[PDB]
Amino acid sequence: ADTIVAVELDTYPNTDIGDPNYQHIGINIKSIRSKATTRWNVQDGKVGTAHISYNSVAKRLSAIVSYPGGSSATVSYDVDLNNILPEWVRVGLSASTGVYKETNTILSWSFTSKLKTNSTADAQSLHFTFNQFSQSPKDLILQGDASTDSDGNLQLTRVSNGSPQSNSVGRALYYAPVHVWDKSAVVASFDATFTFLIKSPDSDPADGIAFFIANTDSSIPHGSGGRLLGLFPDAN
Amino acid sequence: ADTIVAVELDTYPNTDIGDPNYQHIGINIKSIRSKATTRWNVQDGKVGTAHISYNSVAKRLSAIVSYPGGSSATVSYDVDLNNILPEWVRVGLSASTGVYKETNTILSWSFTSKLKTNSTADAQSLHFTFNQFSQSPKDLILQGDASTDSDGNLQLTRVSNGSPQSNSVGRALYYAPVHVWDKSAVVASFDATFTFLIKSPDSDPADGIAFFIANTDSSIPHGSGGRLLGLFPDAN
Amino acid sequence: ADTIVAVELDTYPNTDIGDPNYQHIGINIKSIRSKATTRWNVQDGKVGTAHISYNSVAKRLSAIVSYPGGSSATVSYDVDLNNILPEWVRVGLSASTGVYKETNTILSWSFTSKLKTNSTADAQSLHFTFNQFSQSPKDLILQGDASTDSDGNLQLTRVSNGSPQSNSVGRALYYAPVHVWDKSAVVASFDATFTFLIKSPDSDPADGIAFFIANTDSSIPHGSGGRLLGLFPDAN
Amino acid sequence: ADTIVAVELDTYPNTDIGDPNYQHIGINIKSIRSKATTRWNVQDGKVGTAHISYNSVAKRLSAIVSYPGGSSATVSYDVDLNNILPEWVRVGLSASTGVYKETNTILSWSFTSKLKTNSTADAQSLHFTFNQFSQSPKDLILQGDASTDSDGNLQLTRVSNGSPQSNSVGRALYYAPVHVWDKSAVVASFDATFTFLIKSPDSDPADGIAFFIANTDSSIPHGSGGRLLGLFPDAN
Ligand SMILES: OC[C@H]1O[C@H](Oc2c[nH]c3ccc(Br)c(Cl)c23)[C@@H](O)[C@@H](O)[C@@H]1O
Ligand SMILES: OC[C@H]1O[C@H](Oc2c[nH]c3ccc(Br)c(Cl)c23)[C@@H](O)[C@@H](O)[C@@H]1O
Ligand SMILES: OC[C@H]1O[C@H](Oc2c[nH]c3ccc(Br)c(Cl)c23)[C@@H](O)[C@@H](O)[C@@H]1O
Ligand SMILES: OC[C@H]1O[C@H](Oc2c[nH]c3ccc(Br)c(Cl)c23)[C@@H](O)[C@@H](O)[C@@H]1O
Ligand SMILES: [Ca+2]
Ligand SMILES: [Ca+2]
Ligand SMILES: [Ca+2]
Ligand SMILES: [Ca+2]
Ligand SMILES: [Mn+2]
Ligand SMILES: [Mn+2]
Ligand SMILES: [Mn+2]
Ligand SMILES: [Mn+2]
């Protein structure tokens, strides 16, 4: 199975697999059962912004999600990612729906990775930004139902004509491998931002959006729909 | 008195004011008596590199100092800087000598600050880099004995002709105020790197180099030589 | 007198001092009488975006101004700025009104400068961004009528209560000097972006907004209102 | 055949295919017969640094190559690349040897691309840096004889044990496609830097190093050794 480090924006409480009894932001380490969560309140149809950062000295993955004029929700978790992830990863977003549904629209996405080795190189770095998406994005690996629409949004899950579809899954990974640790490595860091638009006609949205880091050859696991956010093959 | 948040590379153990019994990297919050330290071994006359990062969600100031081919020393400390620092600060380096002495040469320095407010601006940012210093650096506030030499090094303490001088103090602050928190602020971060060259003809070097963040109008306090690193007026 | 290199977004044709018979973007070298212009059509009350870039090998200052869904206006001019500007400059925006008037609102501003010397340093660099302005921006030198309003816009000229005022002048310079050439310099570059909002209740707006680079101690010259854009003391 | 825009650092004069009678930096547009060149003097065994920049408003590709303490060689050429290149490209370095030989060692490489569309997005961007190369660089497409050595240099052509080999060709492309123009595009830019080490035991080195931009699926053309720099299938 894949190796997954993820930040989930979780729109639908699944109490049987560890979700708290409310919508929440979470830190996922090799499991859908978040290691930490914070209460977060979806604002139907508004543009949200998520920020994720980490560095290998501090060893603390943090995430914060906000809406305009509104107070934010943040979460943190002490973790040494370099003992978890492989040296080379891909990064991405995913989203899913189940019996309940929502738009999982990404409006923009940026990422930065830095590796600083002893000698004293500013040793290797990657920064990408998208503030909209090309109708045919050649630098994105599109998985499952993910596509870009003609407003240049990235629609991670199916929408037929304003209307989000149930039991949909989709993921976009940046085309280049990222080098996240090395043998002669002194400090590695990353920071990602994405803005997103979650809308539902139902009183209850599902299932969420996640930012995630995985083995380079990660693909959507079998059985990963709805609650498992296209990240995991099961709920362990 | 000034408000000081600093990372010290401390070359000389002052056991009467809290230094551990070895050279050490430290985190200083409003006091010379570090809140956290880690053993570090000065390599006389080699080029060292220090990295410092922080963000306001994770709330963990970390620092790591390394030399080429060598293992590093890191330190961390959980702190909410936004409850400590003012909204606007300056950033800088300082150094001092006392009865013992060393070159406090900076070879390069970069800094990044980011403030992200709710609305969803990438709201305000500053990045500067120097990989050498102009003989007359108009974007640096030079304090005390700080000057740039004709190899374009920043000599924070006095050197007359290869030879570091005792009881010297010096500081360089970047000319622009940095905006580190706001009312509508969601996350603030910074990262600094500097490379430095500490040399002594004595068996024992003193006193150290620090990176620091202070009120914009911070200046060298009276009585801040030697052990107090040009950061503090006393040892409380 | 000051040394001025500027890109003007010129809203009002002054045919007696060289303006073409239409609103226009221009390149100004030590004179209000642009060295090059291109036709540009103000869209009353829309948000515009201007981009300016230069590097010292290519020796070609270019500028382009656009509005959403609309085609842009670009201009270029072959110039060696390093033989014109001093080694250290400040950068800024200015704006003016005269008998005719407009809002000269800046919504955001970013700038980048890079100097690469032979040895092979990435030798010195500055990047700043603002996507809104602090009610009390300590890293901006505010001149004349320039102020930030409570939406965090930078109002370069006077507006009393929705309404732009006639015979107003204002400028904002970034607080730090920029190092634009050196003796051992191989290539120097800069790029600036700003977004702006020009509105008038009159059929005819005046006078314009400019991005500009000047001696560090540049201030608004006497007699520089209206057509001279707060850049020049006269029209030579 | 491939579509090639390249900057060549050309170590060996081939007078029968248009080379001037000296080592030279050149701008190549769809042909090995440079559109512009400047005299450049290889310094055997020193570390050189090359800078390349372009933007689509100015429409002027420029390049400059320097060695430490030394004066540089620059070249420029007025070209609209967006009418030449496809919307999506890859970028890379290549090098070759023939009957004469040299090390074609890259010590570091960085690239930046920016696309700014009307609406007013900072619309899409890529920045990568390498200051050394991983023994197994998963984010580089290695072609022909290109490999990384155990000092973490990128050896574009064969070296067996200090000694550069004759009739060798090699190329490294960054793994991700770059988006260089769009339909709603206002301005596109890029800047690349690389540092390199060319050494020969012969009195006469050959053949050179190039930075290049090509269709995403570009590979080494048949018959492109020696003088054609691994860029072209012939000399037209
Ligand atoms: O989209 C929300 C949820 O929908 C499904 O679970 C159900 C939520 N309400 C139900 C009602 C009936 C049945 Br059968 C099911 Cl599986 C469900 C499943 O797809 C869950 O994974 C998902 O989290
Ligand atoms: O530079 C090292 C140290 O030198 C001075 O302290 C002394 C170290 N050895 C001594 C021996 C005698 C006397 Br008096 C003094 Cl003050 C000292 C003081 O300046 C200290 O602040 C400094 O840390
Ligand atoms: O704001 C537009 C213009 O207004 C003034 O010029 C006039 C434009 N129409 C006029 C009508 C009468 C008189 Br008096 C004047 Cl000075 C003007 C002057 O302030 C000009 O500098 C400015 O460009
Ligand atoms: O490496 C330098 C040059 O070597 C070859 O050309 C020759 C240079 N001197 C020669 C002498 C004899 C013969 Br046969 C040849 Cl092909 C050559 C060819 O490989 C050229 O493409 C290359 O530019
Ligand atoms: Ca859930
Ligand atoms: Ca001490
Ligand atoms: Ca005018
Ligand atoms: Ca040749
Ligand atoms: Mn959950
Ligand atoms: Mn100490
Ligand atoms: Mn004009
Ligand atoms: Mn040639």
Side-chain angles (χ1 to χ4, degrees):
Chain A
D2 284 343
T3 299
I4 302 289
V5 163
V7 172
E8 64 170 47
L9 273 39
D10 181 334
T11 57
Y12 178 85
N14 309 90
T15 52
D16 44 312
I17 60 158
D19 277 1
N21 221 173
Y22 42 85
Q23 310 178 302
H24 60 278
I25 173 157
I27 295 175
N28 297 349
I29 305 303
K30 283 188 296 176
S31 170
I32 197 62
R33 301 175 182 253
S34 299
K35 307 295 179 191
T37 60
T38 307
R39 182 139 184 162
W40 165 67
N41 298 107
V42 167
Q43 297 188 12
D44 185 54
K46 321 289 196 143
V47 172
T49 310
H51 300 300
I52 294 135
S53 63
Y54 174 84
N55 80 268
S56 57
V57 179
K59 289 181 185 88
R60 189 185 196 105
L61 182 54
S62 71
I64 178 177
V65 183
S66 58
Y67 283 108
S71 61
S72 54
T74 81
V75 64
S76 288
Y77 182 64
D78 287 333
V79 61
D80 197 323
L81 293 180
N82 302 302
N83 298 334
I84 288 180
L85 283 157
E87 227 188 53
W88 294 91
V89 293
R90 282 193 159 102
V91 300
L93 313 156
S94 60
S96 56
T97 66
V99 166
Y100 299 142
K101 61 202 174 288
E102 67 190 23
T103 58
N104 299 127
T105 300
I106 300 312
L107 280 70
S108 84
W109 182 25
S110 78
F111 176 83
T112 287
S113 179
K114 300 182 153 96
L115 186 61
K116 304 141 166 189
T117 70
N118 61 55
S119 78
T120 134
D122 341 36
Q124 200 184 329
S125 75
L126 210 209
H127 179 43
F128 65 75
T129 290
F130 303 97
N131 282 291
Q132 260 150 65
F133 303 76
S134 169
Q135 203 123 344
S136 214
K138 300 207 178 306
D139 56 354
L140 285 183
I141 295 162
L142 299 173
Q143 292 179 339
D145 297 324
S147 70
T148 55
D149 69 19
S150 64
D151 311 342
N153 306 301
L154 168 59
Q155 310 283 4
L156 288 172
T157 47
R158 288 281 170 217
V159 293
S160 310
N161 318 347
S163 174
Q165 301 302 288
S166 72
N167 311 123
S168 172
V169 67
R171 320 203 300 192
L173 297 186
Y174 186 69
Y175 205 98
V178 184
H179 196 195
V180 295
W181 197 242
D182 193 72
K183 293 179 179 179
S184 65
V186 153
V187 44
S189 66
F190 60 78
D191 295 82
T193 287
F194 68 93
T195 69
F196 59 89
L197 181 109
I198 295 183
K199 242 182 206 134
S200 205
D202 324 315
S203 45
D204 288 336
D207 279 278
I209 305 171
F211 164 87
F212 77 100
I213 304 173
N215 35 306
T216 62
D217 62 327
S218 173
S219 56
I220 301 173
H222 173 60
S224 71
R227 71 196 187 179
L228 296 184
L229 299 179
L231 298 182
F232 297 101
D234 58 57
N236 305 173
Chain B
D2 284 343
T3 299
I4 302 289
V5 163
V7 172
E8 64 170 47
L9 273 39
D10 181 334
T11 57
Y12 178 85
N14 309 90
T15 52
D16 44 312
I17 60 158
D19 277 1
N21 221 173
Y22 42 85
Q23 310 178 302
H24 60 278
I25 173 157
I27 295 175
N28 297 349
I29 305 303
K30 283 188 296 176
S31 170
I32 197 62
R33 301 175 182 253
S34 299
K35 307 295 179 191
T37 60
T38 307
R39 182 139 184 162
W40 165 67
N41 298 107
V42 167
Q43 297 188 12
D44 185 54
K46 321 289 196 143
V47 172
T49 310
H51 300 300
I52 294 135
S53 63
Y54 174 84
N55 80 268
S56 57
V57 179
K59 289 181 185 88
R60 189 185 196 105
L61 182 54
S62 71
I64 178 177
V65 183
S66 58
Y67 283 108
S71 61
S72 54
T74 81
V75 64
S76 288
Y77 182 64
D78 287 333
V79 61
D80 197 323
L81 293 180
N82 302 302
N83 298 334
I84 288 180
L85 283 157
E87 227 188 53
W88 294 91
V89 293
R90 282 193 159 102
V91 300
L93 313 156
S94 60
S96 56
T97 66
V99 166
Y100 299 142
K101 61 202 174 288
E102 67 190 23
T103 58
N104 299 127
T105 300
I106 300 312
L107 280 70
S108 84
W109 182 25
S110 78
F111 176 83
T112 287
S113 179
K114 300 182 153 96
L115 186 61
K116 304 141 166 189
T117 70
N118 61 55
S119 78
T120 134
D122 341 36
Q124 200 184 329
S125 75
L126 210 209
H127 179 43
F128 65 75
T129 290
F130 303 97
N131 282 291
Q132 260 150 65
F133 303 76
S134 169
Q135 203 123 344
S136 214
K138 300 207 178 306
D139 56 354
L140 285 183
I141 295 162
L142 299 173
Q143 292 179 339
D145 297 324
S147 70
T148 55
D149 69 19
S150 64
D151 311 342
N153 306 301
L154 168 59
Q155 310 283 4
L156 288 172
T157 47
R158 288 281 170 217
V159 293
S160 310
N161 318 347
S163 174
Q165 301 302 288
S166 72
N167 311 123
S168 172
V169 67
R171 320 203 300 192
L173 297 186
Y174 186 69
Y175 205 98
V178 184
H179 196 195
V180 295
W181 197 242
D182 193 72
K183 293 179 179 179
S184 65
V186 153
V187 44
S189 66
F190 60 78
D191 295 82
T193 287
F194 68 93
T195 69
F196 59 89
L197 181 109
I198 295 183
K199 242 182 206 134
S200 205
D202 324 315
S203 45
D204 288 336
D207 279 278
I209 305 171
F211 164 87
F212 77 100
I213 304 173
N215 35 306
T216 62
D217 62 327
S218 173
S219 56
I220 301 173
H222 173 60
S224 71
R227 71 196 187 179
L228 296 184
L229 299 179
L231 298 182
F232 297 101
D234 58 57
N236 305 173
Chain C
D2 284 343
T3 299
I4 302 289
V5 163
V7 172
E8 64 170 47
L9 273 39
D10 181 334
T11 57
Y12 178 85
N14 309 90
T15 52
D16 44 312
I17 60 158
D19 277 1
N21 221 173
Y22 42 85
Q23 310 178 302
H24 60 278
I25 173 157
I27 295 175
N28 297 349
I29 305 303
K30 283 188 296 176
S31 170
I32 197 62
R33 301 175 182 253
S34 299
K35 307 295 179 191
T37 60
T38 307
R39 182 139 184 162
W40 165 67
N41 298 107
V42 167
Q43 297 188 12
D44 185 54
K46 321 289 196 143
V47 172
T49 310
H51 300 300
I52 294 135
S53 63
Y54 174 84
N55 80 268
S56 57
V57 179
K59 289 181 185 88
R60 189 185 196 105
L61 182 54
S62 71
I64 178 177
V65 183
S66 58
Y67 283 108
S71 61
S72 54
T74 81
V75 64
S76 288
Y77 182 64
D78 287 333
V79 61
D80 197 323
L81 293 180
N82 302 302
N83 298 334
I84 288 180
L85 283 157
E87 227 188 53
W88 294 91
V89 293
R90 282 193 159 102
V91 300
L93 313 156
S94 60
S96 56
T97 66
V99 166
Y100 299 142
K101 61 202 174 288
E102 67 190 23
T103 58
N104 299 127
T105 300
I106 300 312
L107 280 70
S108 84
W109 182 25
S110 78
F111 176 83
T112 287
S113 179
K114 300 182 153 96
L115 186 61
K116 304 141 166 189
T117 70
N118 61 55
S119 78
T120 134
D122 341 36
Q124 200 184 329
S125 75
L126 210 209
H127 179 43
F128 65 75
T129 290
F130 303 97
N131 282 291
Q132 260 150 65
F133 303 76
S134 169
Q135 203 123 344
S136 214
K138 300 207 178 306
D139 56 354
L140 285 183
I141 295 162
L142 299 173
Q143 292 179 339
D145 297 324
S147 70
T148 55
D149 69 19
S150 64
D151 311 342
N153 306 301
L154 168 59
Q155 310 283 4
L156 288 172
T157 47
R158 288 281 170 217
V159 293
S160 310
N161 318 347
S163 174
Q165 301 302 288
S166 72
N167 311 123
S168 172
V169 67
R171 320 203 300 192
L173 297 186
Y174 186 69
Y175 205 98
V178 184
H179 196 195
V180 295
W181 197 242
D182 193 72
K183 293 179 179 179
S184 65
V186 153
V187 44
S189 66
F190 60 78
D191 295 82
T193 287
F194 68 93
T195 69
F196 59 89
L197 181 109
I198 295 183
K199 242 182 206 134
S200 205
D202 324 315
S203 45
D204 288 336
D207 279 278
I209 305 171
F211 164 87
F212 77 100
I213 304 173
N215 35 306
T216 62
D217 62 327
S218 173
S219 56
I220 301 173
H222 173 60
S224 71
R227 71 196 187 179
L228 296 184
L229 299 179
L231 298 182
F232 297 101
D234 58 57
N236 305 173
Chain D
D2 284 343
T3 299
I4 302 289
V5 163
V7 172
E8 64 170 47
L9 273 39
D10 181 334
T11 57
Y12 178 85
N14 309 90
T15 52
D16 44 312
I17 60 158
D19 277 1
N21 221 173
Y22 42 85
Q23 310 178 302
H24 60 278
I25 173 157
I27 295 175
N28 297 349
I29 305 303
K30 283 188 296 176
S31 170
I32 197 62
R33 301 175 182 253
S34 299
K35 307 295 179 191
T37 60
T38 307
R39 182 139 184 162
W40 165 67
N41 298 107
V42 167
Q43 297 188 12
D44 185 54
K46 321 289 196 143
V47 172
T49 310
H51 300 300
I52 294 135
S53 63
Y54 174 84
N55 80 268
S56 57
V57 179
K59 289 181 185 88
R60 189 185 196 105
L61 182 54
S62 71
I64 178 177
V65 183
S66 58
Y67 283 108
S71 61
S72 54
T74 81
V75 64
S76 288
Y77 182 64
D78 287 333
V79 61
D80 197 323
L81 293 180
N82 302 302
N83 298 334
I84 288 180
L85 283 157
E87 227 188 53
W88 294 91
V89 293
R90 282 193 159 102
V91 300
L93 313 156
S94 60
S96 56
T97 66
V99 166
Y100 299 142
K101 61 202 174 288
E102 67 190 23
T103 58
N104 299 127
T105 300
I106 300 312
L107 280 70
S108 84
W109 182 25
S110 78
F111 176 83
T112 287
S113 179
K114 300 182 153 96
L115 186 61
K116 304 141 166 189
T117 70
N118 61 55
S119 78
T120 134
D122 341 36
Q124 200 184 329
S125 75
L126 210 209
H127 179 43
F128 65 75
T129 290
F130 303 97
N131 282 291
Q132 260 150 65
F133 303 76
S134 169
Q135 203 123 344
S136 214
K138 300 207 178 306
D139 56 354
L140 285 183
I141 295 162
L142 299 173
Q143 292 179 339
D145 297 324
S147 70
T148 55
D149 69 19
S150 64
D151 311 342
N153 306 301
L154 168 59
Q155 310 283 4
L156 288 172
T157 47
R158 288 281 170 217
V159 293
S160 310
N161 318 347
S163 174
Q165 301 302 288
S166 72
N167 311 123
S168 172
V169 67
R171 320 203 300 192
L173 297 186
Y174 186 69
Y175 205 98
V178 184
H179 196 195
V180 295
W181 197 242
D182 193 72
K183 293 179 179 179
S184 65
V186 153
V187 44
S189 66
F190 60 78
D191 295 82
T193 287
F194 68 93
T195 69
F196 59 89
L197 181 109
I198 295 183
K199 242 182 206 134
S200 205
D202 324 315
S203 45
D204 288 336
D207 279 278
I209 305 171
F211 164 87
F212 77 100
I213 304 173
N215 35 306
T216 62
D217 62 327
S218 173
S219 56
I220 301 173
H222 173 60
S224 71
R227 71 196 187 179
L228 296 184
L229 299 179
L231 298 182
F232 297 101
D234 58 57
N236 305 173

